[PDB]
Amino acid sequence: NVDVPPRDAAERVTFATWAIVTGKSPGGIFNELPRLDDEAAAKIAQRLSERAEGPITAEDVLTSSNIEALADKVRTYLEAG
Ligand SMILES: [Zn+2]
Ligand SMILES: [Zn+2]
DSSP: OOOOOOOSHHHHHHHHHHHHHHSSOOOSSSSOOOOOOHHHHHHHHHHHHHHHTSOOOHHHHHTOSSHHHHHHHHHHHHHHO
16 A cells, blocks of 8 residues: 555645644555644644635544545535535
């Protein structure tokens, strides 16, 4: 199995935001994500909300299995902008 890098704007910003806040890259868009504390989840959510210009919550971040899933939420906002 091989890591899949981010494919579009939504995946790149989501992947990068996760890595920046936690200090560790998710590896790829399908990799299982490590568990976060609520502060890291809130920061990721705030940053994604600002960039996507739509509401992304700490719960959205916490319930995402991988970056692809979280980026899907971000993508819905980018295409509606
Ligand atoms: Zn890897
Ligand atoms: Zn998808």
